[PDB]
Design goal:
Three copies of one chain form a homotrimer.
Chain A lengths: L2 H23 L3 H22 L15 H15 L9 E2 L4 H26 L7 H19 L6 E2 L5
Antiparallel strand pairs in A: 1-2
Helix pairs in contact in A: 1-2, 1-4, 2-5, 3-5, 4-5
Chain lengths: 160, 160, 160
């Protein structure tokens, strides 16, 4: 019901999709560490979205900070650097890992929408950072999906 | 936010669920080709839903056409022909492939709802064909799930 | 569109997520029987949510009864009894089975929200029992996820 409650739950659903990718996609050590850090960040995003903003909090805030987003942006550029240009649009799938990352990607985008909806409902009580974080995360998951498809992505083909 | 944006995103989520079925369900060659064609059609459905209808477009339209739907309807009848009558209601699951197709099936039905919602919000700017396509696709995925369960489906049992 | 239709469909999506857990998580005999019973209950929950309540029905009702909920509550206590105290918050994932149960858990919570929304839209024509059932089911799936992670859960870690 509550816009904050919905956004929080969607973050949890996106987080579980990353857990499935890690558990069923068998990523290498490097990718594993990146994904595990993201699971930790998504918990933070959920806590942030669920907690209304208060003036001069006396408790340690658990909020997504700009540095979280700067970090995803850095990983995006670092990982995308070693990839060839796309010849056609990518269809979701390929290796078990790429397929599972595409699933997480789409769930993350659904979570981004509710995070923005939370902001719309409480412009003064909800931070826009969780939404921006999820916005950058889906782009990173797209890149990682490509990284996880060594032999090329599944491509769309014009009807005729 | 936008009804078109939501419908588009749900199609992408359904498309990723089909990608997982293909990647983790190890379907045979025949089923693979059918599912790959559907992934291509779902991209088209997304492009259609996201693009508002314009009079006398000067660009090649990327729209779901009736022929897409006629094709799914044909596959439905062709595949359902070799199946026995249901003794009870089917519970989602069984083989890895059938279970993964049931997951995609339910996501497709969620996408169908937003496609219809897009039509409701813009009766003159959104085509009903994407929604009809998704409507027929969930029925086909139900049939394929049965096809992928050679030893029988998981059946519901009256409480007592 | 219809609040009952949406709630019904979400129950079906949650049911398919349990089917994936069973099909890809390879649970032992005990867990299998519990999950299979839940799939049967979720069918009932869907039928209940989809069928508006009528006075003096002449047909056998297919409704979630309090006994369904009492049963989940009993399993929750029985399974949680053999588990150690949590040292930190749990991140969704771990073993294939635990990861798949966390995915189902989050879908069940999404279904709970629409079941409550159905009640809100038709306070006199929709039972609150399906919603209560889903409320208890996500807590049980959390417990089972822990049970399925013999070597410990994936834990959240404070930023610094």
């Amino acid at each position: 019901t509550d816009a904050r409650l919905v956004a929080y739950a969607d973050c949890d659903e996106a987080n579980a999709a990353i857990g499935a990718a890690l558990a069923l996609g068998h990523p290498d050590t490097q990718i594993t560490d990146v994904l595990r850090q993201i699971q930790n960040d998504l918990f933070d995003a959920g806590a942030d979205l669920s907690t209304p903003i208060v003036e001069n909090p006396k408790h340690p805030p658990l909020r997504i900070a700009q540095s979280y987003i700067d970090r995803l942006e850095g990983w995006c550029d670092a990982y995308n650097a070693g990839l060839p240009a796309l010849k056609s649009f990518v269809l979701p799938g390929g290796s078990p890992l790429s397929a599972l990352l595409h699933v997480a990607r789409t769930v993350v985008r659904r979570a981004e929408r509710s995070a923005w909806a939370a902001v719309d409902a409480h412009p003064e009580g909800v931070s826009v950072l969780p939404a921006k974080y999820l916005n950058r995360l889906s782009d990173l998951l797209f890149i990682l999906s490509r990284v996880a498809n060594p032999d090329g992505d599944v491509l769309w083909r014009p009807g005729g």
